[PDB]
Design a protein around this ligand. Structure first.
Ligand SMILES: [Mg+2]
Ligand SMILES: [Mg+2]
Ligand SMILES: [Mg+2]
Ligand SMILES: [Mg+2]
Length: 158
RNA sequence: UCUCAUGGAGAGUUCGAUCCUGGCUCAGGAUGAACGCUGGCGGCAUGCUUAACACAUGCAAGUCGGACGGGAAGUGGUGUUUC
């Protein structure tokens, strides 16, 4: 139970005999601001019903984002999703969230308050937003590296 | 849980609609600036990017008499002296 925001709304058509069925395509991103990031797509004849379907589809797939004590990424990472490549790096405190439209919301709704990102591929919000999820799933904390490597955290800081 | 990092935002347009590819356009900052409308003061700076085209007028490199000969002025037409 938490809030959501519409990332994009777009009308799609049909070429039936009599005319055209103009129905909406709603992309919705869901985030509690404390991890629990979700991306979903919905489609319906009405605007409101399309947002509801995307909300269920976004809540159908939720993933936590690794963050640090200062609400930043542990390290930089890139990802690709079709023709959509997205870039991410950590940032200093007080820097703020700066990124493209599709990338700002999914990070802004995640909880990270200080980071930066850039998209190097297509301008599609869907293909770019999903790339962010692929980017964050592949990142971890320093502790996860230590247990999977057999070296303490202080020894790696050197 | 250290420290480093003070730094990379996009948007619209091909299609009935979608995902791509690829050009065009915009949001930023700067100027030896110019034009338009408007206009109170102060401080620090700047001011022919074109015809290295042609130029009236005035000035912009003179100085030493303690290097020398002469000359002039003044004075009591005499000494010192000034030019
Ligand atoms: Mg870009
Ligand atoms: Mg059209
Ligand atoms: Mg000149
Ligand atoms: Mg001499």
């Amino acid at each position: 139970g938490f809030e959501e925001n519409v990332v994009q709304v777009r009308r799609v058509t049909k070429v039936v005999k009599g005319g055209k069925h103009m129905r909406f395509r709603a992309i919705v991103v869901v985030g509690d601001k404390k991890g629990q990031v979700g991306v979903g797509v919905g489609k319906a004849k009405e605007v409101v019903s399309a947002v509801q379907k995307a909300a269920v589809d976004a809540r159908r797939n939720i993933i936590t984002v690794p963050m640090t004590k200062y609400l930043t990424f542990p390290h930089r990472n890139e990802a690709d999703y079709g023709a959509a490549r997205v870039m991410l790096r950590p940032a200093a405190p007080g820097t703020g969230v700066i990124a493209g439209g599709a990338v700002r919301t999914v990070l802004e709704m995640a909880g990270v308050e200080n980071a930066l990102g850039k998209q190097l591929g297509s301008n599609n919000a869907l293909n770019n937003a999903r790339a962010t999820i692929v980017a964050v799933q592949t990142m971890r904390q320093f502790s996860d590296v230590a247990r999977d490597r057999g070296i303490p955290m202080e020894e790696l800081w050197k």
